[PDB]
Design a protein around this ligand. Structure first.
Ligand SMILES: CCCCCCCCCCCCCCCCCC(=O)OC[C@H](COP(=O)([O-])OCC(O)COP(=O)([O-])OC[C@@H](COC(=O)CCCCCCCCCCCCCCCCC)OC(=O)CCCCCCCCCCCCCCCCC)OC(=O)CCCCCCCCCCCCCCCCC
Ligand SMILES: CCCCCCCCCCCCCCCCCC(=O)OC[C@H](COP(=O)([O-])OCC(O)COP(=O)([O-])OC[C@@H](COC(=O)CCCCCCCCCCCCCCCCC)OC(=O)CCCCCCCCCCCCCCCCC)OC(=O)CCCCCCCCCCCCCCCCC
Ligand SMILES: CCCCCCCCCCCCCCCCCC(=O)OC[C@H](COP(=O)([O-])OCC(O)COP(=O)([O-])OC[C@@H](COC(=O)CCCCCCCCCCCCCCCCC)OC(=O)CCCCCCCCCCCCCCCCC)OC(=O)CCCCCCCCCCCCCCCCC
Ligand SMILES: CCCCCCCCCCCCCCCCCC(=O)OC[C@H](COP(=O)([O-])OCC(O)COP(=O)([O-])OC[C@@H](COC(=O)CCCCCCCCCCCCCCCCC)OC(=O)CCCCCCCCCCCCCCCCC)OC(=O)CCCCCCCCCCCCCCCCC
Ligand SMILES: CCCCCCCCCCCCCCCCCC(=O)OC[C@H](COP(=O)([O-])OCC(O)COP(=O)([O-])OC[C@@H](COC(=O)CCCCCCCCCCCCCCCCC)OC(=O)CCCCCCCCCCCCCCCCC)OC(=O)CCCCCCCCCCCCCCCCC
Ligand SMILES: C[C@@H]1CC[C@@]2(OC1)O[C@H]1C[C@H]3[C@@H]4CC=C5C[C@@H](OCCC(CO[C@H]6O[C@H](CO)[C@@H](O[C@H]7O[C@H](CO)[C@@H](O)[C@H](O)[C@H]7O)[C@H](O)[C@H]6O)CO[C@H]6O[C@H](CO)[C@@H](O[C@H]7O[C@H](CO)[C@@H](O)[C@H](O)[C@H]7O)[C@H](O)[C@H]6O)CC[C@]5(C)[C@H]4CC[C@]3(C)[C@H]1[C@@H]2C
Ligand SMILES: CCCCCCCCCCCCO[C@@H]1O[C@H](CO)[C@@H](O[C@H]2O[C@H](CO)[C@@H](O)[C@H](O)[C@H]2O)[C@H](O)[C@H]1O
Lengths: 53, 57, 87, 383, 106
């Protein structure tokens, strides 16, 4: 009986968690990209065109 | 070839800084609006009391 | 280390410019010449002061490569020309 | 979209049938507009009918006022249906483009023929009637959407940059609304959060003060021909008329809940005429309904209560935000492992570069200490 | 007491709780080297914020479902004094029921 009552909400929470994970992944991708750009910048092999792209 | 490129180059840092701040703001909002919801469920003592009454005790 | 150039500065000192806040400050108190973080930024004093960043060999913890789905945006249009192609 | 020979053949083949269909649509739309204009003149407010003058406070230049020179006919459903209004809007667009082309023809005589060849080779400025099949119509809609993508970001950036450079929001809610208004279409914007931007910009710039360049960008984004642009009060009138018709239709639909009963293709067209749903996104009914409901929510209760829509500039920015796609990024991340200045390696470092590396390299602290100690010793010796 | 059973809601996507937890662990495992040490009063990092949000949601779902791990729930879901009080209330109840069932069986 309790499971039937707490059914819509648990599914909504799971979906929200999945959406949150999918939302956070791009942020980490951008962070990795910035790390690589910084690495190349410190080596003096980064062009502004690459940075803008 | 010369002017617009130079002014774009001058723009780049400020825009990068502002967009970084905006992203930080949005993640900050993500965590701010999260709260732990403690649910309340009917106490079983009342259930036991109703069971006793049904017995005619 | 190589002899390549870095992010252009225009001969400006970032510790006194009108957009100085956009340039990160390091431990020594010298604002970077670029939006990136620079540990060895310096200032040279000719008739006017100017900031300089010397490239060096430094190791940075590299986050693993993400999937193409989460950073590629296939919104290219026929009129679009990338900065590399333009260069 | 660029011109092509296939589109040229398509438009040449369907030229005369297209003209005939355009003439029939012209007759029908003239009837519809006659009904609407009679109703406006009879039941319209005194200011709207008399064309009250609203002048700018700086240069005293007249322009259409959203409150006074725009009127929502709440009782138009009795005389004119929603489908007739949509037909009139589509015909207005087609007639505008055809009128510009005809004006060019009359002005230049027979020298416009090669320019006509350039015109028929692209679907950007041809009427919808030139498409006699579904595939042709799809290509035409694709061309219109491409033009909208090309034009909208400039308008959005103009608005945002001018406001942010010359003004700032008053309160935090206005700040959030302003920041979220210009987000890319890949994220969903909450109309309730974004609405206060309308009042803020009313405090900054109303529709009556819209600049001519911003108007040109907007008309580009609305597939409205801009050459010859002329004074800003002509295309401004076109925009006012189009959005007045759109608001009348929106009130009709909201009151009668027609969109729920509206079919999929008609719903897609209704959203498209509001610049909410590109055809290249392949949206389903759920997404279209979500966008339409968001648009109605952005209009707000006051729209139904009194027929007063929010600031038209902010409304146009909001709706056109769906054509502001995320900036393209193509190429594997491995490309970031390359180097850009290998061609300089052969040059090496000169004396000044070697000095800079020595002074600002890993030995920088030692060099600084040695130099400062030497300078202090020399200064002490001098004294 | 509760009310009418809430209207059925279709999931927007199909995924198991175990799969979500595994995905979260994989996401947070690659940034362990980058992840940084901070005090309670210091400002937090992106990795720390993501970890806190994800773990909070995960353990809230587990608590509602009934997989009560009081240590993990305490660490990741308990941020406010009132919430801590409620956790203490829950901890006593579960132990009391377990003891009651055992002795009722004995
Ligand atoms: C190959 C062809 C070559 C063509 C050459 C001819 C020129 C070009 C032709 C046309 C080109 C196309 C584009 C034209 C501009 C479009 C402007 C526009 O968008 O208007 C929208 C606008 C529509 O908007 P709206 O909301 O309906 O109304 C406007 C609002 O009121 C707006 O509200 P507002 O708040 O802005 O209100 C202000 C508004 C109010 O005005 C209006 O908008 C109302 C309309 C204009 C009224 C103008 C008449 C005013 C009274 C004149 C009285 C003269 C008395 C003299 C008596 C003499 C007795 C001896 O503006 C004014 O106040 C301006 C007043 C005019 C001032 C003129 C000053 C001139 C100074 C001269 C200096 C010296 C010159 C040299 C020396 C000469 C002497 C020796 O259109 C109009 O209002 C009328 C447009 C008329 C267009 C021009 C028609 C051209 C006809 C040409 C015929 C001859 C051809 C010859 C060919 C020769 C062989 C090739
Ligand atoms: C042979 C001599 C030639 C002379 C040289 C000409 C040189 C070329 C210049 C351009 C000439 C016109 C070209 C044809 C345009 C098509 C007709 C038209 O007006 O379309 C409506 C449409 C109205 O636009 P709108 O923005 O919606 O109007 C706002 C009003 O509130 C709208 O009011 P509403 O909101 O109440 O709604 C009313 C609407 C409601 O109606 C509807 O909804 C039903 C549809 C009605 C319009 C249908 C138009 C169809 C257009 C396509 C036609 C087929 C083309 C086929 C091409 C292929 C052929 C093989 O009905 C209207 O559109 C009526 C507008 C007012 C009538 C305008 C016509 C006046 C001139 C004709 C009379 C001349 C009498 C001469 C007497 C001589 C005495 C000595 O016209 C336009 O799109 C404007 C023209 C765009 C190009 C402008 C180019 C610059 C013009 C500068 C002129 C300056 C003065 C002249 C000197 C120039 C020297 C440089
Ligand atoms: C049968 C048909 C049905 C009946 C007819 C119906 C009516 C038809 C007519 C109406 C049609 C209207 C719609 C037209 C749409 C298409 C327009 C267009 O052209 O689109 C661009 C069109 C391509 O369009 P698209 O690819 O579809 O892209 C469209 C996009 O949406 C891109 O769009 P977008 O918006 O980015 O592009 C716009 C772009 C449009 O512009 C362009 O795209 C430029 C086009 C030309 C580029 C040329 C590049 C190549 C140059 C080569 C140079 C020579 C090389 C060496 C040759 C050696 C030969 C031996 O910019 C503009 O709009 C600027 C407008 C400028 C207006 C100028 C006004 C001046 C007024 C003067 C001041 C007056 C003030 C008042 C004074 C008052 C005084 C009283 O361009 C071309 O196709 C280029 C053609 C190049 C031809 C070859 C080079 C020239 C050959 C000249 C031969 C001369 C022979 C005689 C010599 C005699 C010597 C003595
Ligand atoms: C590196 C070197 C390379 C080479 C460089 C070459 C050398 C260049 C040096 C100088 C360059 C700068 C010159 C600037 C001059 C001053 C301009 C100025 O003051 O403009 C004010 C102002 C600025 O224009 P706007 O309306 O604000 O916006 C302009 C934007 O570009 C609008 O842009 P939008 O994005 O807003 O709209 C885009 C789109 C929007 O789409 C639409 O609007 C739909 C399509 C519209 C179609 C056109 C409708 C026209 C309606 C009637 C217009 C009034 C007619 C008046 C009576 C006729 C007068 C002749 O519009 C278009 O795509 C327009 C297509 C036009 C294609 C033609 C462009 C010129 C190419 C060359 C062809 C002619 C060559 C002659 C010489 C050679 C002979 C052998 O101009 C006007 O008000 C326009 C009035 C137009 C009157 C008609 C033209 C008068 C000039 C004489 C024409 C002679 C024809 C000869 C025929 C052949 C005889 C053999
Ligand atoms: C290859 C080259 C070949 C040779 C080329 C030769 C070149 C000659 C050089 C000299 C030309 C000087 C004039 C340049 C005009 C362009 C200016 C411009 O675009 O400025 C941008 C300017 C900047 O705007 P914005 O900064 O974006 O915004 C500021 C405001 O917010 C804007 O807000 P707004 O739009 O509300 O406010 C403006 C509006 C506000 O007012 C209104 O809305 C009310 C409109 C009132 C109209 C009154 C008309 C009165 C006419 C009386 C006629 C009576 C009948 C007489 C009949 C018998 C005699 C013929 O007032 C006006 O702009 C209209 C003023 C009166 C227009 C008169 C007609 C044009 C005369 C052109 C010739 C001038 C003398 C040239 C010789 C001397 C040169 C030093 O925008 C405008 O002014 C927009 C309107 C532009 C309309 C004029 C152009 C129309 C197209 C001409 C068609 C004919 C083509 C002929 C080709 C010939 C080839 C050889
Ligand atoms: C800017 C550049 C300049 C150069 C250019 O490009 C643009 O200008 C452009 C302007 C072009 C002309 C425009 C118009 C025509 C008439 C057409 O005619 C149809 C057939 C019949 C009429 O239907 C012809 O029968 C006539 O009928 C008339 C009675 O109706 C009689 O009167 C007349 O005697 C008699 O011949 C025959 C083609 C031609 C000449 C074009 C040639 C190419 C251009 C010179 C372009 C050329 C490439
Ligand atoms: C070359 C020129 C080309 C012009 C092209 C455009 C032509 C447009 C023609 C429109 C004709 C409309 O017809 C006209 O409508 C108005 C408004 O309903 C009517 O107006 C009538 O009712 C209104 C409203 O109660 C009264 O204010 C008015 O006193 C009365 O006459 C006119 O009696 C009728 O003649």
């Amino acid at each position: 009986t309790l499971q039937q009552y707490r059914r819509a909400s648990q599914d909504k929470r799971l979906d929200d968690l999945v959406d949150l994970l999918e939302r956070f992944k791009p942020v980490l991708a951008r962070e990795a990209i910035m790390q690589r750009l910084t690495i190349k910048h410190l080596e003096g092999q980064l062009g502004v065109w690459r940075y803008m792209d | 070839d010369i002017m617009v490129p130079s002014f774009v180059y001058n723009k780049l840092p400020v825009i990068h800084f502002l967009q970084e701040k905006r992203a930080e703001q949005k993640l900050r909002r993500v965590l701010d609006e999260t709260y732990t919801e403690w649910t309340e469920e009917l106490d079983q003592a009342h259930v036991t009391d109703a069971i006793t009454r049904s017995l005619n005790i | 280390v190589g002899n390549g150039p870095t992010f252009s500065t225009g001969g400006e000192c970032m510790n006194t410019c009108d957009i100085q806040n956009a340039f990160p400050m390091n431990d020594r108190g010298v604002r970077s010449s670029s939006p990136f973080q620079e540990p060895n930024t310096a200032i040279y004093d000719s008739y006017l002061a100017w900031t300089y960043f010397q490239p060096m060999d430094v190791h940075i913890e590299k986050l693993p490569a993400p999937e193409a789905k989460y950073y590629q945006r296939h919104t290219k249009k026929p009129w679009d020309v990338s900065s590399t192609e333009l260069t | 979209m660029q011109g092509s020979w296939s589109v040229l053949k398509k438009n040449c083949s369907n030229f005369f049938p297209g003209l005939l269909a355009f003439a029939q649509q012209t007759q029908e739309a003239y009837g519809i507009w006659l009904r609407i204009y009679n109703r406006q003149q009879k039941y319209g407010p005194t200011d709207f009918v008399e064309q009250s003058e609203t002048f700018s406070p700086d240069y005293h230049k007249r322009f259409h006022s959203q409150d006074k020179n725009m009127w929502v006919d709440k009782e138009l459903c009795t005389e004119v249906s929603q489908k007739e209004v949509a037909r009139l809007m589509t015909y207005k667009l087609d007639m505008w483009r055809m009128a510009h082309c005809a004006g060019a023809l009359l002005a230049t005589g027979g020298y416009a023929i090669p320019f006509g060849l350039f015109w028929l080779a692209n679907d950007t400025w041809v009427p919808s009637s030139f498409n006699l099949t579904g595939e042709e119509l799809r290509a035409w809609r694709e061309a219109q959407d491409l033009y909208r993508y090309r034009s909208a970001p400039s308008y959005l950036t103009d608005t945002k940059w001018h406001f942010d450079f010359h003004a700032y929001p008053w309160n935090e809610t206005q700040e959030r609304a302003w920041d979220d208004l210009f987000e890319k279409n890949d994220v969903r914007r909450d109309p309730k959060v974004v609405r206060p931007a309308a009042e803020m910009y009313d405090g900054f710039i109303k529709f009556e003060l819209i600049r001519r360049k911003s108007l040109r960008h907007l008309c580009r984004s609305m597939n409205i021909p801009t050459f010859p642009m002329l004074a800003r009060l002509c295309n401004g009138t076109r925009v006012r008329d189009y959005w007045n018709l759109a608001w009348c239709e929106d009130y009709m639909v909201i009151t009668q809940r027609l969109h729920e009963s509206m079919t999929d293709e008609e719903l897609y067209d209704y959203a498209w005429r509001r610049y909410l749903a590109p055809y290249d996104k392949n949206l389903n009914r759920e997404q279209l309904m979500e966008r339409v409901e968001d648009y109605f929510e952005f209009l707000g209760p006051d729209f139904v209560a009194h027929g007063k829509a929010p600031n038209l500039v902010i409304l146009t920015n909001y709706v056109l935000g769906y054509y502001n796609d995320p900036a393209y990024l193509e190429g594997d991340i491995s490309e970031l492992d390359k180097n850009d200045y290998d061609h300089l390696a052969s040059w090496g470092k000169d004396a000044f570069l070697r000095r800079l590396e020595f002074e600002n390299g890993p030995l920088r602290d030692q060099v600084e200490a040695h130099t400062q100690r030497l300078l202090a010793e020399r200064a002490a010796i001098a004294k | 007491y509760k009310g009418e059973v809430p209207p059925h809601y279709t999931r927007k996507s199909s995924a198991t709780i175990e799969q979500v937890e595994k995905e979260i662990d994989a996401l947070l495992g690659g940034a362990e080297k980058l992840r940084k040490t901070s005090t309670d009063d210091q400002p937090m990092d992106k990795l720390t914020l993501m970890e806190r949000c994800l773990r909070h949601a995960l353990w809230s779902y587990h608590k509602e479902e009934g997989r009560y791990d009081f240590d993990q729930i305490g660490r990741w879901v308990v941020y406010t004094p009132e919430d801590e009080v409620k956790l203490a209330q829950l901890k006593r109840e579960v132990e009391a029921k377990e003891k009651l069932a055992a002795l009722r069986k004995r």
